[PDB]
Amino acid sequence: PFESSSKSDESLGSIIIEGTLDKFQLHKYFFIRRLRLLKLEDQTLTAFVG
């Protein structure tokens, strides 16, 4: 649920973004992905940099 699913949370947000409902605010999935993936390994030295 941290970085093996860094592809999977992006793919799930992309599959939710295939639904075009409220496309300005349909990046709430992208906001949850940007919170989740960057908050996955927030304790790091360089691995969060990319």
Curated annotation (Swiss-Prot):
Protein name as it appears in the record: Trafficking protein particle complex II-specific subunit 130
Domain of life: Eukaryota
Role: Specific subunit of the TRAPP II complex, a highly conserved vesicle tethering complex that functions in the late Golgi as a guanine nucleotide exchange factor (GEF) for the Golgi YPT1 GTPase. TRS130 plays a role in the YPT GEF activity of TRAPP II in concert with the two other TRAPP II-specific subunits TRS65 and TRS120. Required for both the cytoplasm-to-vacuole targeting (Cvt) pathway and starvation-induced autophagy through its role in ATG8 and ATG9 trafficking.
Additional facts recorded: Present with 432 molecules/cell in log phase SD medium.
Compartments reported by the entry: Golgi apparatus
Subunit-structure text: Part of the multisubunit TRAPP (transport protein particle) II complex composed of BET3, BET5, TRS20, TRS23, TRS31, TRS33, TRS65, TRS120 and TRS130. Interacts with YPT31 and YPT32.
Residues of the full protein shown: 252 to 301 of 1102
Organism of provenance: Saccharomyces cerevisiae (strain ATCC 204508 / S288c)
Family that this chain belongs to: Belongs to the TMEM1 family.
